[PDB]
Design a protein around this ligand. Structure first.
Ligand SMILES: [Mg+2]
Length: 84
């Protein structure tokens, strides 16, 4: 499964690398778990609605969530800072 970062989500991730290493580790942990079970597991995975229909969200922290989408061959990260 290829990992795809939107330009904004990669910037989010870089922000964390230069702000909080434990948040980076949690993001990594969530991505690895998602590779295992796409729609369940760590971070209490929940499907998003309305304008974000088609995406999922896992908890990094209360304020920050990993927003993503899973296709037959890829994990797309839409954002990893704030709720979206
Ligand atoms: Mg953003």
């Amino acid at each position: 499964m290829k990992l795809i970062w939107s330009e904004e989500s990669w910037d989010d991730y870089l922000y964390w690398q230069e702000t909080d290493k434990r948040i980076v580790k949690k993001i990594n942990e969530l991505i690895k778990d998602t590779r295992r079970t796409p729609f369940e597991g760590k971070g209490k995975p929940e499907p998003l609605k309305h304008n974000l229909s088609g995406f999922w969200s896992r908890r990094i922290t209360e304020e920050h969530r990993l927003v993503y989408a899973v296709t037959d061959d890829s994990l797309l990260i839409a954002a990893c800072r704030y709720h979206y």
